[PDB]
Design a protein around this ligand. Sequence first.
Ligand code: ZN
Ligand code: ZN
Lengths: 280, 313
Amino acid sequence: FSWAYPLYKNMLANFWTPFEINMSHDAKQFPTLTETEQEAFKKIIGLLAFLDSVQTDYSMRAAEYLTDSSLAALMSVLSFQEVVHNQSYSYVLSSLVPKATQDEIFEYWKHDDVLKERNEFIIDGYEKFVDNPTPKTFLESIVYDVILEGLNFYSGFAFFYNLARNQKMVSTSTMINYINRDEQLHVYLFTNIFKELLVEFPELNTEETKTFVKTTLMKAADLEKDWFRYIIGDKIPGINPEDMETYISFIANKRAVQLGMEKPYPEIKHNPMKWIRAYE
Amino acid sequence: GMEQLQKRKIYDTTASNASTGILNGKSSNVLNWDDVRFSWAYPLYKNMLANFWTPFEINMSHDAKQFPTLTETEQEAFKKIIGLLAFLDSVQTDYSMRAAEYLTDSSLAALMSVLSFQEVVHNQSYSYVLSSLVPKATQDEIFEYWKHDDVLKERNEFIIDGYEKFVDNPTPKTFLESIVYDVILEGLNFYSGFAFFYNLARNQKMVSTSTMINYINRDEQLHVYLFTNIFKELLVEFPELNTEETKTFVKTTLMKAADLEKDWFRYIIGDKIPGINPEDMETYISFIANKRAVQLGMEKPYPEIKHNPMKWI
Ligand SMILES: [Zn+2]
Ligand SMILES: [Zn+2]
């Protein structure tokens, strides 16, 4: 894996800390956002904190499962980055909302049936690996990983960048940008591992696996679109639901391609939110 | 005897975010850093994060130019010590991380992730020093000598035998034993070797290497703080472990570990390095064993050793 050392160097080079981002202006602007904007912000941060807490743990377990030293070392850097990402959401909420509200956001995952539905799709994917680690259950879990990091986070980044392009919550947008830079390399690592498992275990490189990837991406994408309809719908200018749904499909295709697999939505060939490229 | 441990659940809707116990507790596994079980966990995280460093910020050119100016015995000791430190990634099973899967506190699990990452960076820093000073073939020879070293094989069997007791029967008692071995590995093992590097640098030689060793050693102090805190909390949580037998275990294990360090020190350095008196080094190793015992809330194995004779440390 000639790419492992340059990746290691790049990940180290991207070090950042949330304590270096001043949240004062954002703190003052937050109560001036619309009701939908403030509620979607809190819900999405609640989602991301759930996802990165679980990802911290999954990646740490993955690192011990990996038999190659360089891939295990890279998985350790990734787990550490997830610790910081997750902590950054506590940092953000401690600056922007009351403590009682922070407590409530960190209990949303237990009490909202929509958030619970989507979360349990991820957990089921990870638990099958954690409870019975094999190259197949590991390979399958990586599809879930690529969904969590490459689809769910990316869908969420759009919300923050849309506020930023409207001069709202710009420090938060800056932190998201740092998380997004790390995320790109996380997806690169996981997609690389998936492709190597198919070389090492050719019995997993079948049509069945292509169908698995499509079906798993499609459900993940359906749940993302539903969530978006539920928390934002057509109430926020700059992120309409038709375009967000097309974006979600486009990103699902991109990830399928990065896994060396076939796209679930081949008709969707063009990025409907190219303005996001200016924030990355 | 003791109840067997249940692995941490990756997701538990029936539990609170703040842990109800370090082992066999309940935790949701969703980590809110402002709502954790231990008031020292977030401050520890913050101190670790503030101390970020990588070997790429350290320029090795001057060390590279100074290296040939050292005595033959100094160059050989350096190669052997840095070589071993770089080599240990290869032949060292990660029992600490297998034990970490049983921590039922999301904040402590996260800190173990930060520790593991720091170890990755420590291991790469040792390679970085070695590769700045010797060509690839020389490194390979150094590793080959360590690969077939009997003193190394015996040291690895001491550590394995202790940690294997947890894998065979994970209980709060074997977990506690494993925490003690963790304190030894980060708080005592190779401290003679680190002193070798500092002995060079106090005399203005190999200062960049010593700087990286010191960053590593600083990280290790926070790791020891974490492990000793877990030890003390385990005695509060599982009072059945707070026995005379536990005090004897800690004293015995620290003394065996101190003796092994002295043997290693004798094998590699001995009386061959200017500035290092072997009697003073051995007293310093006893002093470290005493410090760890105190940090664990235990009695000093060497009560006669009250002061550190290597004043320059
Ligand atoms: Zn993340
Ligand atoms: Zn990630």
